[PDB]
Ligand binder design. Structure first.
Ligand SMILES: *[C@@H]1O[C@H](CO)[C@@H](O)[C@H](O)[C@H]1NC(C)=O
Ligand SMILES: *[C@@H]1O[C@H](CO)[C@@H](O)[C@H](O)[C@H]1NC(C)=O
Ligand SMILES: *[C@@H]1O[C@H](CO)[C@@H](O)[C@H](O)[C@H]1NC(C)=O
Ligand SMILES: *[C@@H]1O[C@H](CO)[C@@H](O)[C@H](O)[C@H]1NC(C)=O
Ligand SMILES: *[C@@H]1O[C@H](CO)[C@@H](O)[C@H](O)[C@H]1NC(C)=O
Ligand SMILES: *[C@@H]1O[C@H](CO)[C@@H](O)[C@H](O)[C@H]1NC(C)=O
Ligand SMILES: *[C@H]1O[C@H](CO)[C@@H](O)[C@H](O)[C@@H]1O
Ligand SMILES: *[C@H]1O[C@H](CO)[C@@H](O)[C@H](O)[C@@H]1O
Ligand SMILES: *[C@H]1O[C@H](CO)[C@@H](O)[C@H](O)[C@@H]1O
Ligand SMILES: *[C@H]1O[C@H](CO)[C@@H](O)[C@H](O)[C@@H]1O
Ligand SMILES: *[C@H]1O[C@H](CO)[C@@H](O)[C@H](O)[C@@H]1O
Ligand SMILES: *[C@H]1O[C@H](CO)[C@@H](O)[C@H](O)[C@@H]1O
Lengths: 398, 151, 395
């Protein structure tokens, strides 16, 4: 019955239930506190009145606060009126009265333990928690607060109502789960939760926030320049710029429309490996793959970085083509080893006798250039069905 | 074809209509205690007791409570005249019959014995009991049970 | 019980319920109609059968059609088996019988009042209606039909089931609303609405169509040559060719990702006469999409509404043409006006008038008496702009 538990208001005898299996009522009087003066009585509609054992607290003023706690031997029944009246033993007066529906009053406790970890996208945060009272997991609506850390602390904390499992945030699945997107990829966040019974079935108010928990988001992988491809729709090979004085390793993950993270779906798997650090492994296509890289900057400290999810058919790297040169004015002629599609490949040529480039139409096999010079052609697949990044640069052609 | 009881929109509609009807009840000042007390079901329960019972016992209790509530509404409506309260109790009986039909479409027709009962006089007690029955045991079953009642 | 209710079929005793609080069953006989001969009876799982008050109607032939309409809502109960059987009381014959579930014969009425107009996009149509029976709007599935209101028709009517999803089509809000795209611009339309209960809990069928309502889609503003641009992300100015013998005014509207309409959602704001051609300007907002509407009054008492494609404020920044430095193969150099992203700017040039456009990424270049010209398109990953302010002729 601490001061932080004073969210109640507008009653002479305030009562509140935390798990809908316990009850405690209190009242405060500004006058003095003679010993044994006041007794609290209660009675369900059938049994005789019974006296709750009292306790006294010392207010900052000269008054005192009297608090009752229902014995565990007695049980509280929902949807049942309860008559509570404080009776002075000396003057026989009834200081206060109230008829209470236990289901209408509620101060649910915040979740005891919270988990906050990075999700699939670089700007997604996954939150999972257990419930102090798992029996009423379906009759509670949660509210979520997250805020930036000491840097940029001027911005006010943001709240969000965890609606339901329809938004991939099931309150029950024992403990619940949720996923929140749009956070800044890389700065730490402090997080707090909240709860409130839904007025449809159980009435009440909000409980206090949980102890704030800090989560370090992975962040975008562009900080280390993670750009990689796949070859001929069969194998995934990823190489990243190796961080100086820090060993780095990378993992991966596969999924197919898993959507809602009921039980922390992302489970990493090691990538086989045989300046810049590379990795390589097999693939099961027509799936979404999330790529992660972890680097140990110092012994015992590691950092996780995440890049945009790949589509294998959308990131295939073509073999580097070769170009033939002709002149009288200078003509062009080139081919493509990957004969899957020519009009789906957008080429580019860098020329120099300060470098300048031009983009011939996709599918072209020849052209004219103005001029000794070296010709280097690069291919990028950009078809509506198959696409991918740029290929390697071929040897210069005179 | 799933039973209509396992569609959550029906229960929400019942709750909304019951709330609207109870709000409307306050608009007729001719409300007076009924000449004869009527029997109303028992809606109070405790979570510790609730978790001990099995699904079949819960369903039987729900069916018995709803049937007894409908019987009480029908008995109460006979004590009135052509006044406003008669129309309100008729609409309430219609809603209770809708609830009973929705439940019977899923839980069968094997009604249990009468069980623990209580009496009341004021007309507001009937509406309050119907609201308690909708918000309490029925919704508890239909939410906590989930798919065990229906696929 | 009118002729429009012949959608029911495949039963000697038709029945239908429009609001799930009323019931009406009708059967027709081609034979003679002696007075007080056929009586309709109904009974719920446990009750004495009762007689519905019967009526009669004429038919094109010598036969007649009888219609029974239940008196009170207390006599119609959902989720119970209803046993209907008629009686030829003249000679004691049960001519017909049927076991009926009231929840499976819904025939909802069409939305009585329909309101619609052009949407935010040039080819977007927004529709809103008030449900005649809002108490069962949860269980109702809607369908929409529309066609060209012009004489004859270029194509047949098209029907689309409203998804009733979060894509700015909240079939229930007690009115409803929805937004449909893909419609052709600049042509009149007529549309109708229809509803059917979802067979999840309450079954039924489609009702009658609503009365057609005419809608004139505004169309696109390209025919008026609309083009807007901003100067240093401060003010947005718009321009369109001056239609002859017709005054015009331009409107602007700002919105965030809350694109879902709600009644008259676009709040147009009048422009100001800036100082053939036409002009407008206003203090635009930030980090939001803007919409431009231009309306032309070709004749008194009438006006044609045209709408332009919405865009972000930072995508159409107008860069004034910069200076030029050249020498007589040619040497190219320039001084970018706003050097925030000076390298990321496309400078197409002319030589004499057409010439190749060198790639961006530099403040100078080279080209292989003469006449020269250039432009400056603000093209960058973070900021974009059009081919604004093509330079004056240069040597
Ligand atoms: C207190 O007042 C009640 C009500 O009049 C009375 O029944 C009871 O005997 C009184 N008790 C004392 C101790 O005065
Ligand atoms: C992938 O790489 C492995 C070794 O790195 C190789 O054995 C295999 O043939 C490659 N292709 C496929 C489809 O696994
Ligand atoms: C997946 O790979 C197999 C074998 O290379 C190929 O037949 C199939 O078309 C591929 N599917 C996709 C979606 O890439
Ligand atoms: C009609 O049949 C019923 C049996 O359902 C019988 O009770 C009744 O007497 C008969 N009446 C006549 C006029 O035949
Ligand atoms: C929009 O914001 C940018 C930077 O936040 C600022 O430079 C610019 O002046 C603003 N423009 C308007 C119209 O608010
Ligand atoms: C924008 O237009 C308004 C028109 O009222 C004008 O007052 C304001 O000075 C303009 N701002 C700029 C930067 O031109
Ligand atoms: C819970 O607490 C909030 C204030 O944080 C109230 O505004 C709300 O009504 C509920 O009681
Ligand atoms: C969590 O913290 C807020 C203040 O930020 C309190 O007002 C609330 O009662 C809860 O303890
Ligand atoms: C090809 O490679 C460039 C980097 O050189 C990428 O930025 C581009 O997106 C494409 O994948
Ligand atoms: C509603 O009406 C349509 C058109 O008659 C039917 O095809 C459909 O089965 C539903 O009954
Ligand atoms: C609307 O109109 C169609 C004909 O276009 C009818 O067949 C239908 O029954 C509904 O009344
Ligand atoms: C300027 O003009 C070119 C065509 O010459 C357009 O393609 C470009 O988008 C810009 O509007």
């Amino acid at each position: 019955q601490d001061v932080s538990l004073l969210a109640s208001d507008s009653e002479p005898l305030k009562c509140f239930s935390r798990t809908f299996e316990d009850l405690t009522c209190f009242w405060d009087e500004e006058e003095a506190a003679p010993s044994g003066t006041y007794q609290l009585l209660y009675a369900y509609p059938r049994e005789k009145p019974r006296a709750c054992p009292l306790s006294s607290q010392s207010m900052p003023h000269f008054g005192t606060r009297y608090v009752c706690q229902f014995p565990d031997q007695e049980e509280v029944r929902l949807f049942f009126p309860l008559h509570l009246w404080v009776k002075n033993v000396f003057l026989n007066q009834t200081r206060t009265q109230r008829v209470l529906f236990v289901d209408s009053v509620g101060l649910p406790a915040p979740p005891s333990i919270i988990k906050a970890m990075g999700g699939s996208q670089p700007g997604e945060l996954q939150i999972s928690w257990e419930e102090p009272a798992p029996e009423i997991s379906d009759f509670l609506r949660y509210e979520l607060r997250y805020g930036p850390r000491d840097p940029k602390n001027s911005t006010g904390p943001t709240v969000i109502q965890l609606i339901a499992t329809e938004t991939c945030c099931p309150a029950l699945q024992e403990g619940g789960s949720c996923l929140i997107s749009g956070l800044q990829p890389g700065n730490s966040y402090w997080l707090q939760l909240r709860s409130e019974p839904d007025g449809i079935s159980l009435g009440g108010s909000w409980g206090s926030w949980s102890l704030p928990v800090t989560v370090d988001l992975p962040g975008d992988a562009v900080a280390l320049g993670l750009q990689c491809f796949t070859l001929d729709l069969k194998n995934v090979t990823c190489q990243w710029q190796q961080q100086d004085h820090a060993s780095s390793q990378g993992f991966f993950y596969h999924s197919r429309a898993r959507c809602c993270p009921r039980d922390r779906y992302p489970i990493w798997e090691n990538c086989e490996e045989e300046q810049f650090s590379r990795c390589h492994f097999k693939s099961r296509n027509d799936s979404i793959i999330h790529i992660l890289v972890e680097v140990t900057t110092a012994p015992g400290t590691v950092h996780s970085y995440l890049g945009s999810p790949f589509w294998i058919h959308q990131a295939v790297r073509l073999p580097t083509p070769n170009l033939h040169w002709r002149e009288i004015h200078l003509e062009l002629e080139w081919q493509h080893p990957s004969s899957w599609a020519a009009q789906e490949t957008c080429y580019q040529l860098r020329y120099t006798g300060d470098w300048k480039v031009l983009e011939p139409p996709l599918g072209a096999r020849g052209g004219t250039l103005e001029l000794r010079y070296r010709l280097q052609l690069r291919a990028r697949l950009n078809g509506p069905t198959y696409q991918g990044p740029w290929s390697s640069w071929s040897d210069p052609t005179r | 074809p799933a039973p209509p009881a396992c569609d959550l929109r029906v229960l929400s509609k019942l709750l909304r209509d019951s709330h609207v009807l109870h709000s409307r009840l306050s608009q007729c000042p001719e409300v007076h205690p009924l000449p004869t007390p009527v029997l109303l079901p028992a809606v109070d329960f405790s979570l510790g007791e609730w978790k001990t019972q099995m699904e079949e016992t819960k369903a039987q209790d729900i069916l018995g409570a709803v049937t007894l509530l409908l019987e009480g509404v029908m008995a109460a409506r006979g004590q009135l005249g052509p006044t406003c309260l008669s129309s309100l109790l008729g609409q309430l009986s219609g809603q209770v019959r809708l609830l009973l039909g929705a439940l019977q479409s899923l839980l069968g027709t094997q009604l249990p014995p009468q069980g623990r009962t209580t009496a009341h006089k004021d007309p507001n007690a009937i509406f309050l009991s119907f609201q308690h029955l909708l918000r309490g045991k029925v919704r508890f079953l239909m939410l906590v049970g989930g798919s065990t009642l229906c696929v």
